[PDB]
Structure 1
Amino acid sequence: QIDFRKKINWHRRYRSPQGVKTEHEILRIFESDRGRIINSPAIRRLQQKTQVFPLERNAAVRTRLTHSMEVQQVGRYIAKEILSRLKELKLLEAYGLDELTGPFESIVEMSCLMHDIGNPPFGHFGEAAINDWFRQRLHPEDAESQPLTDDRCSVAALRLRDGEEPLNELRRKIRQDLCHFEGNAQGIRLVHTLMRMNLTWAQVGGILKYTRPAWWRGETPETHHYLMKKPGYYLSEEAYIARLRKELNLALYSRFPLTWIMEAADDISYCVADLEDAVEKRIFTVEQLYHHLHEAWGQHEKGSLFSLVVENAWEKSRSSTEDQFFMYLRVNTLNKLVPYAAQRFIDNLPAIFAGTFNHALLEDASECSDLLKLYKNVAVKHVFSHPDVERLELQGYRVISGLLEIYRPLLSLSLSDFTELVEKERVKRFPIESRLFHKLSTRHRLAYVEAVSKLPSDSPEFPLWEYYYRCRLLQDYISGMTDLYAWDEYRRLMAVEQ
């Protein structure tokens, strides 16, 4: 049965409100969330992480922040549309949404602003560098089965030990989890453990985009292959995600229903803006792009989506010109795709409310997905392949790789040693590791101490947990930087300024 009063959970994990509350009071709770996120350094850091193109000196080009503001507007539209379609069918009060219309929009709007919030410096490629670096150190593939005679893991305590252990199972997960850094998984970690933001359950449920644990190793279930495409949370947040699922009435591996809306806003807004920027960087002219788009849609059936959206805007663009073409390319795309998405949401509402619907709102079967597929194909062949873009991706991979090597000393240390570094500020015989340790952000160091202290001191799995938490500490520090700070710190510690 469908009741959003059971899904739009305004409770918090810490110092929480309880007890009935009016429509106005619930509104004010979710508006507090807006203020918490909007004033977060993690959102502000989005304006110096890159979206496709290198940061230009005239801000003509999108950054992670300006792109996310556009996604938020698309999500706002899809949510507003679902609610209006629903008010006209009279299902609003029946679905328990009449006193939650505000929050329903706000959560989607905020979830949009917060995808990419946990993304590391150089995007897809910062993730690549992190996971590659830990793959060579931990070799998770050497822990898939029976302990291996040559365990290529670098860490004594994490190597599969032959003497039939259940400890080998925790080793297995720790090794896999740490080699699946994922921006979405990092986003939950960031909003909860690192930034201490204390959002509402519903707000955090909105950015839990995938439901697969990072430590997952086998084949994904056929029934949840889409919800578990990529990792959605770390081992470090398992207890929190368990608290969250109960609070949001989610089965294991189920997704929060408003997540589908934010996802469709991403899938829509993901690409058109990148074509607009390509024209601004003079990669091709607006005229060339129209014909690159005409050619790549293939079979023209005059009545098709192409004619209604892109050909329409091309005709309108004659009588400024590029502003006009892209304004109407965006609008035409929105006016066809938002209703399609909002409708898909209502038509599949039981499974989406249950959180089990194993498809996107814009599933590959739709002509609408073909329109979006059209924008990606032109973007891949003419934008994302551009030498300036690819070079930035090469540079970013080297920068993050280089940063991790600089902090290797913190990892190539015994437990007794590293702990001495955490207790005492001045360690006599580890001057470099001391000084390296102090460069780590106070908020990240605090999350390491808190996690480590909550473990039972006496356990035989304690050193395994500590190493996991130390590794998270380094990844927290690295993924939190902007592109430019990471590039600067690389140069500074490699020594090229003073």
Structure 2
Amino acid sequence: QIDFRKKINWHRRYRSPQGVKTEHEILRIFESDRGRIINSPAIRRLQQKTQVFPLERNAAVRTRLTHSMEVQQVGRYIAKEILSRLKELKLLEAYGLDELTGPFESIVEMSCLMHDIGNPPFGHFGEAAINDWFRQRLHPEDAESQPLTDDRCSVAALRLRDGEEPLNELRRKIRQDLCHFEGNAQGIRLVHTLMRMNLTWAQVGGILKYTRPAWWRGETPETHHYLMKKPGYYLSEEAYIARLRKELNLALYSRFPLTWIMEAADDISYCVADLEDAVEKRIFTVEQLYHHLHEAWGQHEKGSLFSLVVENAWEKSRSNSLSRSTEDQFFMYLRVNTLNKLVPYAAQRFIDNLPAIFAGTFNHALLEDASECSDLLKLYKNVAVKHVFSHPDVERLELQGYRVISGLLEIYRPLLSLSLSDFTELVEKERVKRFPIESRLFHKLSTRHRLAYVEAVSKLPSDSPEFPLWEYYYRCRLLQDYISGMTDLYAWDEYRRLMAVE
């Protein structure tokens, strides 16, 4: 049975409110969450995190922040659309929404905003440089089966000890979790354990994009293939994640019903914006672009969504009055045209498949592969791939980023290349005799990730044989948090500073 009262959980993890609360009181809790997010430094960092193009001397180009604001307005429209359609179907009161109208919408916007929030400095390239750096040091492939006589793992404790132990399963999980860093998974880690925001369960649900654990090694459930496409959470969050499922009434590997709306918005805002910026960076003319889009469509019909969107927007741009620029008018209406056709589709799709979406079991996207909508998006993507993403200044920066992170990770290798007894020593005494470089390097780490490490560690049993393995898992996590937390600029600046060129 579909009841959103049961999905829109206004309770929190710590200092949680309880008992009755009015429509207004509830709105205020969700409005509180907005203020929390909007004032977060983690949200400010995004104006200094690159989105496709390098951080140019003129803000004409979109940053991770400006893009996420755009995504959020798309999300707003979709949510608003679902709602309006449902009020016309009268099912609003019936699905327990008549009083959670505003909240629903806010959650979408706020989740939209917080997509990419957990992304590292150089995004997908950052992920690579992290995962790769860890892979050469852990080799999680060497853990998959039986204890290898020649285990490529650089860590004594994580190396699979010979023909014995269920501890061998703990080593397997740690190696896969640390080597499979994902922005979304880091995002969950961030809002709770790192940023210590204490958001409504419902909100945190909306930013849980994937149901796959980072430690997962095998083939993905056939029935849950799509939902476990990428990892959604770390081993460090497994506990809290369980807490989240129970609060939001989710089965193991079940998605929060609103996440689908936020996802959709990000699948649309995705390209068009960078395509606008492409013509802005003079890569080609708006005319040149139109012709690349015509070339890309091929199977041309006079009533297709190409004609209705792209052909339509092209005609508006030519003999465009309003004294408005050709390019401006073009992109302006192209954006409009897209949303005006795609938003209704996804809004409908949601409502159409609502029981499976409510269950969070629905193994598909709102704009799925077969849809003329998915095709239009793909068209933008293809053009962007073949012309924009391929540009040398992009690629240069992509390569640059990789080295910055890799090098930075190597600068911090000494902290990892250490014994527990020694490392712990450094945690208690801030000034350690024999390890002065390690001391200073540990001081370079941000007070929040530092704090978080200690807390996770203090919760473990000293006596436990798994305790040293955990320490290392957390140690790596701590380092990962520092790095992923940085902006493209800070990470690059630090790389040069620690390479000694400033």
Give the TM-score normalised by the residue count of structure 1: 0.99
Structure 2 residue matching 1:32: 3-state secondary structure: helix
Offset at residue 389 of structure 1 (A): 0.3
Match of 1:144 in 2: 144
- Give per-residue Cα distances to partners, 1:67-90, cap 9 Å, x unaligned: 000000000000000000000000
Deviation at 1:268, TM superposition (A): 0.7
- Aligned equivalents of 1:320 and 1:283: distance in 2? 18
Tell me the residue number matched to 1:461.
466
Q: CA deviation at 1:20?
A: 1.1
- Aligned-partner SS, 1:209: coil
Alignment partner, residue 230 of structure 2: 230
In 1: Cα distance, 2:16 partner to 2:351 partner: 32
The within-5 A match list for 1:427-438 is 427-438=432-443
CA distance in 1, matches of 2:424, 2:95: 53
Secondary structure of 1:215's counterpart equals coil
Distance in structure 1 (CA, Å) of the matches to 2:164 and 2:95: 53
Specify the SS of the correspondent of 2:423.
helix
Name the SS for the 1:186 alignment partner. helix
1:121-180, CA deviations, whole angstroms, 9 ceiling, x for partnerless residues? 001100000000000000100001110000010000000001410000000000000000
Once the two structures are overlaid, the 10-residue window that deviates more, 318-327 or 465-474, is: 318-327
1:63, distance to aligned residue in structure 2 (A): 0.2
For residues 422-452 of structure 1, the C-alpha deviation after alignment (integer angstroms, 9 at most, x for no partner) is 0001000000000000000000000000000
Deviations 1:270-316 (A, max 9, x none): 00001000000000000000000011001111000000000000001
Structure 2: distance between partners of 1:48 and 1:340: 34
Q: Structure 2 CA distance, aligned partners of 1:142 and 1:313?
A: 54
- In 2, the alpha carbon distance for the partners of 1:255 and 1:164 equals 37
Identify the residue that residue 370 of structure 1 maps to in structure 2: 375
How many Å separate the matches in 2 of 1:144 and 1:369? 36
Post-superposition shift, 1:114? 0.2
Deviation at 1:265, TM superposition (A): 0.2
**SS at the partner of 1:158?**
coil
Whole-angstrom distance in 1 between the partners of 2:427 and 2:302: 69
Could you say what secondary structure the match of 1:270 adopts? helix
Q: Could you list the per-position Cα deviations for residues 353-383 of structure 1 after superposition, in whole angstroms to 9, with x for gaps in the alignment?
A: 0000000000001000000010000000000
What is the distance in 1 between the residues matched to 2:432 and 2:81? 60
> Alpha-carbon deviation of 1:409?
0.4
* Superposed displacement of residue 487, structure 1: 0.1
Q: Any gaps of 5 or more consecutive residues in structure 2?
A: 319-323
For residues 229 and 72 of structure 1, what CA distance do their matches in structure 2 show? 23
Take 1:413 and 1:32, find their aligned partners in 2: how far apart are those partners? 43
Q: Matched residue pairs, number?
A: 497
Structure-1 separation of matches of 2:144 and 2:122: 30
- Superposed, which structure 2 residues align to 1:392-407 within 5 Å? 392-407=397-412
Q: Secondary structure at the match of 2:232?
A: strand
Return the offset for 1:320: 1.5
**C-alpha distance in 1, partners of 2:210/2:348?**
22
* TM-superposed deviation, 1:206: 0.2
Q: Deviations over 1:159-210 (max 9, x none)?
A: 0001410000000000000000000000000000000000000000000000
**Cα offsets for 1:34-53 (capped at 9, x unmatched):** 00000000000000000000
Hey, what's the Cα distance between the residues in 2 that align with 1:146 and 1:324?
Answer: 62
Map of 1:298 onto structure 2: 298
Aligned 1:63-462 pairs, distance under 5 A: 63-318=63-318, 320-462=325-467
Greater shift, 415-424 or 161-170, is seen at: 161-170
Distance of 1:244 and 1:384 partners within structure 2? 37
* Distance in 2 between residues matched to 1:144 and 1:336, nearest whole Å: 46
Q: Secondary structure at the match of 2:11?
A: coil
Partner Cα distance (1:11, 1:470) in 2 = 31
Q: How many angstroms apart in 2 are the aligned matches of 1:7 and 1:235?
A: 25
Instruction: Provide the secondary structure at the position in 1 that maps to 2:335.
Output: helix
- Divergent runs of 4+, >3 A: none
Gaps of 5+ in 1: none
Structure 1 CA distance, aligned partners of 2:122 and 2:79? Answer: 31
Q: Secondary structure, in 3 states, of the residue corresponding to 1:84?
A: helix
Q: Superposition RMSD on alpha carbons, in Å?
A: 0.5
Q: Distance in 2 between matches of 1:408 and 1:373?
A: 41
Separation in 2 of the partners of 1:71 and 1:179?
29
Instruction: Supply the distance in 2 between the matched residues of 1:227 and 1:163 (Cα, whole angstroms).
Output: 35
Query: Residue 321 of structure 2 corresponds to which residue in structure 1?
Result: none
State how far apart, in whole Å, the 1-side matches of 2:205 and 2:126 are: 25
Report the counterpart of residue 3 of structure 2 in structure 1.
3
Match of 1:239, SS? helix
CA distance in structure 2 between the partners assigned to 1:399 and 1:484 by the alignment: 10
Aligned equivalents of 1:306, 1:139: Cα separation in 2: 47
Deviations 1:324-366 (A, max 9, x none): 0000100000000000000000000000000000000000010
Q: Distance in 2 between matches of 1:355 and 1:21?
A: 27
Q: 1:7 offset after TM fit, Å?
A: 0.2
How far apart, CA to CA, are the structure 1 residues paired with 2:218 and 2:101? 40
Which deviates more from structure 2 when the two are superposed, residues 208-217 or residues 314-323? 314-323
CA distance in 2, matches of 1:167, 1:344: 46
Q: Shift of residue 236 of structure 1?
A: 0.2
Please say if 1:486 is aligned against 2:480: no
Encode CA deviations 1:445-490: one digit per residue, 9 max, x unaligned: 0000000000011000000000000000000000000000000000
Q: Distance in 2 between matches of 1:310 and 1:407?
A: 50
Please give the alpha-carbon distance, in whole angstroms, between the structure 1 residues aligned to 2:224 and 2:52. Answer: 30
What CA distance in whole angstroms lies between the structure 2 residues aligned with 1:298 and 1:179? Answer: 42
SS in structure 2 of the partner of residue 156 of structure 1: coil
For 1:175 and 1:151, the matched residues in 2 are separated by 12
Aligned residue for 1:232, secondary structure, equals strand
Q: What is the match of residue 44 of structure 2?
A: 44
